[PDB]
Each structure stands twice: as structure tokens, then as C-alpha cells.
Write a protein that binds this ligand. Structure first.
Ligand SMILES: COc1ccc([C@H](C)NC(=O)[C@@H]2C[C@@H](O)CN2C(=O)CNC(=O)c2ccc3cc(F)ccc3n2)c(Cl)c1
Ligand SMILES: [Ca+2]
Length: 224
């Protein structure tokens, strides 16, 4: 099946990504707090709902929150400033707080039920966001010998997410706070730069060209 691409709102970042965030893939963004990772997660939740000539997939979003950083009014602001009805945009986001890593795994199973349900409608799920994906795994699996256990449990959770992405043609977007193995399709490092900008760099992506993207956090979410 054709790979769909969701615009980030930034032409610079979209170019770095090869056109946007891909369906049939897990894109991981990582960086320090305020680096743009979570602002990008909120922006994509709006952008996916747009028609393709506007950078979206005529889809809906699902958002797993692990550290209570989801802000519905921020989604409403981004939507309103892009010409969209804020409440209709918020209605196209399914939201869940993951209480712990085991609950996070169950939420991925439940996401499959909603994905299946909406698959052949005019607005299928096209984006599944997991914000600070590793937070509960780092809090719970700690101490002597915890590296192997944590990495196996994360590898399984990521394999579950890859299957949803591939089986249902959705984009899976995950964020993480800054030698460990990783299994996302594409990893993007974000940092603050000068002039209030954020800088993006692809990590271990020989398949994508050399460069860094520059973007701003605005009332439209993310843009150049
Ligand atoms: C202040 O106004 C609001 C208005 C809306 C929201 C969010 C966007 N919408 C909601 O919370 C809706 C309102 C009700 O219809 C239940 N609901 C779910 O989204 C319920 N979610 C689920 O049942 C559910 C299962 C499994 C899930 C699995 C996932 F991976 C991700 C999300 C998942 N979400 C917020 Cl945070 C604030
Ligand atoms: Ca952020």
C-alpha cells in the first residue's frame, strides 16, 4: 500500500523527513523538555485531519499521554489559527492517560479496536501518538539487570506499534525525553537553537540526505 505523509506544519522539517511523517512507520522524536517534541505531537494531531492537498490524510488521531502533557486548548488554538473548527478537531482525537507501562500496553490493544472500527469510514484513524513512550518503562524497570528486561518489554511494545502502523496504514509518532538499542523506523533529535527556533537532525538515517531543519513554535503549532 502507498505510504501516506502527514505534514508537520514546517516546510523545513517536512523536507528533512522526505515529505512528512510516514504511515507504515514509527517516527521517534527525542530531545529535552521544550525541544518541540510535544508541540509537534499536538500539531500532528491537527494536521492529520486535513485533506491531502493541505498535508493531511483526512484522518483522526489517537493520543497516549504518559506524563500529563496533553493540552486540549493547545489543539483548539492550532486548529483555530489554521482555519479549522476547534471543537470538531478536538472531537477527532481519542485521548488516554497511560497509568503505568502495563496499562500502556493494554491501551495499544484497545487502539486496534477503534482503528478496525473506523478503517473503512470517511475518517479512519491515521495517527497514533505515544508521548514520552519510555517514561513508565524507565520508572518501573530499574536496577541490576533491568536493562535487558526493560529493552525486551519496550521492543515488544514497539513491535505491537509497528504492526498497527503496517496493518492499518497509520503513522505512529512517539516522543522521548533525552548505547541503548532503539527500534523506531526513523529517529529525529530536536534541540533549541537561536531566535526561539528549534533544530531537527535525523539520527542514523543514511537513507535520508544530510542536513538539519529549522522551525518555530507558534500559534499554528509548528511552522518554519
Ligand atoms: C476539555 O475538553 C476535552 C475534550 C476532549 C478531550 C479529548 C481529546 N477527548 C476525550 O477525552 C474524549 C471525550 C470522551 O468522548 C472520552 N474521550 C476519549 O478520548 C476516550 N478515549 C478512549 O476511550 C481511548 C481508548 C483507547 C485509546 C488507545 C490509545 F492508544 C489512545 C487513546 C485511546 N482513547 C479532552 Cl482531553 C478534553
Ligand atoms: Ca515540546
Amino acid at each position: 500500500a502507498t505510504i501516506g505523509r502527514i505534514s508537520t506544519g514546517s516546510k523545513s522539517l517536512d523536507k528533512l523527513l522526505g515529505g512528512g511523517i510516514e504511515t507504515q512507520a514509527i517516527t521517534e522524536v527525542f530531545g529535552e523538555f521544550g525541544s518541540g517534541k510535544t508541540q509537534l505531537a499536538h500539531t500532528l494531531a491537527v494536521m492529520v485531519q486535513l485533506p491531502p492537498e493541505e498535508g493531511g490524510l483526512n484522518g483522526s488521531a489517537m493520543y497516549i499521554d504518559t506524563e500529563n502533557t496533553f493540552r486540549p486548548e493547545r489543539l483548539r488554538e492550532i486548529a483555530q489559527n489554521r482555519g479549522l473548527d476547534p471543537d470538531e478537531v478536538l472531537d477527532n482525537v481519542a485521548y488516554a492517560r497511560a497509568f503505568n507501562s502495563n496499562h500502556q500496553m493494554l491501551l495499544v490493544q484497545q487502539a486496534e479496536d477503534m482503528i478496525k472500527e473506523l478503517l473503512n469510514t470517511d475518517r479512519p484513524v491515521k495517527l497514533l501518538i505515544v508521548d514520552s513512550l519510555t517514561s513508565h518503562f524507565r520508572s518501573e524497570y530499574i536496577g541490576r539487570g533491568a536493562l535487558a528486561e526493560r529493552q525486551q518489554k519496550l521492543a515488544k511494545h514497539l513491535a505491537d506499534l509497528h504492526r498497527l502502523a503496517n496493518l492499518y496504514d497509520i503513522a505512529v509518532f512517539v516522543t522521548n525525553q533525552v548505547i541503548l538499542a532503539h527500534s523506531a523506523t526513523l529517529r529525529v533529535y530536536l534541540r533549541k537553537g537561536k531566535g526561539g527556533k528549534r533544530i531537527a537532525r535525523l539520527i542514523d538515517a543514511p537513507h535520508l540526505p544530510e542536513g538539519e531543519a529549522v522551525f518555530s513554535i507558534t500559534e499554528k503549532g509548528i511552522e518554519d
